[PDB]
């Protein structure tokens, strides 16, 4: 099982690489996300300011 | 050497590989969290200055 076992170990290394690579794609996206939900955060704060203005 | 000793070494190592990556991925995405909040806090702060 020595010459079955390496072949399995090579596969594990390739796998360790793909799981870490999904996270790094995730991270970039996570950064993009932060700008989108902040784009939405301004125009919801904008309608909040018109709220206490129209109240005035 | 013996088949039992090599199979014991196979499970242990491909485990080490799988675990270290899961934690590795987990650190990468934990940081992804950190940058999301810090980056949002900043970006929001500026636009809200203009709004105010």
């Amino acid at each position: 099982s020595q010459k079955n076992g390496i072949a399995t170990l090579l596969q594990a290394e390739k796998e360790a690489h793909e799981i870490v690579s999904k996270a790094r794609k995730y991270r970039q996206d996570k950064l993009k996300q932060a700008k989108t939900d902040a784009a939405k955060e301004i125009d919801s704060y904008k309608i909040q300011k018109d709220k206490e203005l129209k109240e005035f | 050497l013996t088949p039992n000793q090599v199979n014991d070494e196979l499970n242990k190592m491909q485990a080490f590989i799988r675990k270290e990556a899961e934690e590795k991925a987990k650190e990468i995405q934990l940081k992804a969290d950190q940058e999301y909040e810090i980056e949002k806090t900043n970006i929001v702060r500026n636009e809200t200055n203009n709004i105010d």
């Binding site: 020595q2 076992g5 390496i6 170990l9 090579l10 594990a12 290394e13 | 050497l1 090599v6 070494e9 196979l10 242990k12 190592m13 491909q14 080490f16 590989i17």
Partner: peptide, 20 residues
Amino acid sequence: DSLKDYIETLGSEYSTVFNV
């Protein structure tokens, strides 16, 4: 027998290739 036992005992699952 010495290169095969040594790369497996330290983890680091990327085996060497020994050709003749």
